[PDB]
C-alpha cells in the first residue's frame, strides 16, 4: 500500500507501488525528470518504460505522486541506441529538453549551430541530453578527425556519436546535446544521466545560473598532452586561451 521513490544520482527518479518482488512493475509507474515536475507515467516492467505518457506531477500527498496527463497522445518507450540505430523515433523530441533549449546559429565565430537556453535557470540544472549511436573507442580513434566532430566518450568501453545525416536537426531532434559548442570558459558540463527512453547516456548540466537565450557551452576535454590530440580549431583556441592565462 506504500509508494517507493528510487532516485538516480542525476536527480531523475522512478516512482510507484512496487510489486511483491520489490520491482517497479505496473500500469501506474512513472519516471520523473530532474525538475520533479515533468513525468512519463504508465506501464513499466522492472523499471523499464514500456508505454510512458507525458504528465505533470501536480502534488504529492503522503509521499504519493498525483499526476495530470498532458494533452495529446505523447507516448514514449525504452529505446536504447545500438551501433547502427540512433532512435526508433528520430524526430520525436524529448519533452523536458524541448522546454529548456533550442538550436540556432552559434555566437562563436565560424562554429555553425549552437545550443541556447529557452528560459532562465539556476545552477546545476539538467538542460539537454547527449544521445547517439554506440561505437567503440577503437573505431573512433582509428579514424580521421573529419569523422569525429560529434563523438562523446561515455565510459571506457563506449563512445556516443551522431553521424551524418543525423547532425541535422531536420533528420534527428530526439535529443539536442550534440549541438552544444566548446568553450574553455564554459557555463555547462557533461554529466552521466540515466534516461528512460535513451538509457545510460550523458546530459548537459549548468554550472551556474543562465539567462534566457544564453548560449550553452561545455569543455570538450580533449587530451592536451597525449601537442593536443584534437581538431585544429580547438588547438588554435587552446593557445589563445593559454595566452590570456
Amino acid at each position: 500500500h506504500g509508494v517507493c521513490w528510487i532516485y538516480y544520482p542525476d536527480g531523475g527518479s522512478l516512482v510507484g507501488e512496487v510489486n511483491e518482488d520489490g520491482e517497479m512493475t505496473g500500469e501506474k509507474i512513472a519516471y520523473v525528470y530532474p525538475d520533479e515536475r515533468t513525468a512519463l507515467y504508465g506501464k513499466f516492467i522492472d523499471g523499464e518504460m514500456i508505454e510512458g505518457k507525458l504528465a505533470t506531477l501536480m502534488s504529492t500527498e503522503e509521499g504519493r505522486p498525483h499526476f495530470e496527463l498532458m494533452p495529446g497522445n505523447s507516448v514514449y518507450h525504452f529505446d536504447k541506441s545500438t551501433s547502427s540505430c540512433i532512435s526508433t523515433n528520430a524526430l520525436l523530441p524529448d519533452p523536458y529538453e524541448s522546454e529548456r533549449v533550442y538550436v540556432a546559429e552559434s555566437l562563436i565565430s565560424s562554429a555553425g549551430e549552437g545550443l541556447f537556453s529557452k528560459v532562465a535557470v539556476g545552477p546545476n540544472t539538467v538542460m539537454s541530453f547527449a544521445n547517439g549511436v554506440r561505437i567503440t573507442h577503437q573505431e573512433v580513434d582509428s579514424r580521421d578527425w573529419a569523422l569525429n566532430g560529434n563523438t562523446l566518450s561515455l565510459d571506457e568501453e563506449t563512445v556516443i556519436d551522431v553521424p551524418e545525416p543525423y547532425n541535422h536537426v531536420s533528420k534527428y531532434c530526439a535529443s539536442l546535446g550534440h549541438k552544444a559548442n566548446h568553450s574553455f570558459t564554459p557555463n555547462c558540463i557533461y554529466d552521466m544521466f540515466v534516461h528512460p527512453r535513451f538509457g545510460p547516456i550523458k546530459c548537459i548540466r549548468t554550472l551556474r545560473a543562465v539567462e534566457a537565450d544564453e548560449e550553452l557551452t561545455v569543455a570538450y576535454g580533449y587530451d592536451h598532452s597525449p601537442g593536443p590530440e584534437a581538431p585544429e580549431w580547438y588547438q588554435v583556441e587552446l593557445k589563445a586561451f593559454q595566452a590570456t592565462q
Binding site: 573507442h137 579514424r143 578527425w145 562523446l152 566518450s153 576535454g221 590530440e229
Partner: peptide
C-alpha cells in the same frame, strides 16, 4: 582519444 570528455 578522438572523442570528448574521456576520463584520462
Amino acid at each position: 582519444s578522438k572523442s570528448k570528455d574521456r576520463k584520462y
